[PDB]
Ligand binder design. Structure first.
Ligand SMILES: *CCC(=O)Nc1cnc(C)nc1
Length: 341
């Protein structure tokens, strides 16, 4: 079996000429030559498993969309007893939006096209009643021709708006700078509006190459958001019934709105109108994915007949959070069976 940086990376004879790329949310990621399809591919090693691995595999195997990364193949031992590592093989993409924004200024045309493809993929995900819940530049892959694919469904959930409410300062898992204000106030992140806020943050980041709300800890994230949107209105406060959340907001000094054209003096005006609508404080007033696609900023691309939806809503058969470790390993084994000879 092949080794990389002193660690086993056992992808069978189909995949050769490994090159170490880095670490991801799962572990070691390499590229390799696929001797069947005659292209280099990306392979990630997954090494007591995590429910996030099963979630990712089940979703990605069910989804089929141009702007969502697929799973091409899965490598594992032929039996549960021998199964230790699982390797997930995917299209090799030149880069991701995190790397690209650290080095490259985007033209307005690239911003527009990237945003289109993000929302086109998101339309499909939300049409399946799924929330990605960790949209951010590093989860947006790009090829040499700037085709964009959304990746990492490890924190995804089925939408559940009727059970979205929670108390003030409830802990949350998803990446801090991309969290909607309501996560810190009264929301579990079980509604589609959670993902639109992340997309808004990504749009702002494409406009300036800097994250718009770089909070350094949980409540600092909310104070960055309020420092630009300004104090919420009476009406938007009245929507927050929880007293600890409400009263926290009422305790703050008045903050003025920072106009988008002052933060982004080089931006297209239609881009800033759409940004405003995605970065709306009140999640009920926030624009939805289909409205966003229909916004004038995206008029060159918008074509709902070419923005497909999922054939059916997605469902987890069992509730993943209460499965023991043996049942989780057993389910991963079953979900990956279709790739065995
Ligand atoms: C979703 C994140 C991801 O898969 N990123 C990634 C990093 N490196 C390569 C080669 N492919 C994908």
């Amino acid at each position: 079996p092949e080794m990389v940086r002193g660690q086993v990376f056992d992808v069978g004879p189909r995949y050769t000429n490994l090159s170490y790329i880095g670490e991801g949310a799962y572990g070691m990621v390499c590229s390799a030559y696929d001797n069947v399809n005659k292209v280099r591919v990306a392979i990630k090693k997954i090494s007591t498993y995590c429910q996030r691995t099963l979630r990712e595999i089940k979703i990605l195997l069910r989804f089929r969309h141009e702007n969502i990364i697929g799973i091409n193949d899965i490598i594992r031992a032929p039996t549960i007893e021998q199964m230790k590592d699982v390797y997930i093989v995917q299209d090799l993409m030149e880069t991701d939006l995190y790397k690209l924004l650290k080095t490259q200024h985007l033209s307005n045309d690239h911003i527009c096209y990237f945003l289109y493809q993000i929302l086109r993929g998101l339309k499909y995900i939300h049409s399946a009643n799924v929330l990605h819940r960790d949209l951010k530049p590093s989860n947006l892959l790009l090829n040499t021709t700037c085709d964009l694919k959304i990746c990492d469904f490890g924190l995804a959930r089925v939408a559940d708006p009727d059970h979205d409410h929670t108390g003030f300062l409830t802990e949350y898992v998803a990446t801090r700078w991309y969290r909607a204000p309501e996560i810190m106030l009264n929301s579990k992140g079980y509604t589609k509006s959670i993902d639109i806020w992340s997309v808004g943050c990504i749009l702002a980041e494409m406009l300036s190459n800097r994250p718009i709300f770089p909070g350094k800890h949980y409540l600092d994230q909310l104070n960055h958001i309020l420092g630009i949107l300004g104090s919420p209105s009476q009406e938007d406060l009245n929507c927050i019934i929880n007293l600890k959340a409400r009263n926290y907001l009422l305790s703050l000094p008045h903050k003025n709105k920072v106009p988008w054209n002052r933060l982004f003096p080089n931006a297209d005006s239609k881009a800033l109108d759409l940004l405003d609508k995605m970065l709306t404080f009140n999640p009920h007033k926030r624009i939805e994915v289909e409205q966003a696609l229909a916004h004038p900023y995206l008029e060159q691309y918008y074509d709902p007949s070419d923005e497909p939806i999922a054939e059916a809503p997605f469902k987890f058969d069992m509730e993943l959070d209460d499965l023991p470790k043996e049942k989780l390993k057993e389910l991963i084994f079953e979900e990956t069976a279709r790739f065995q000879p």
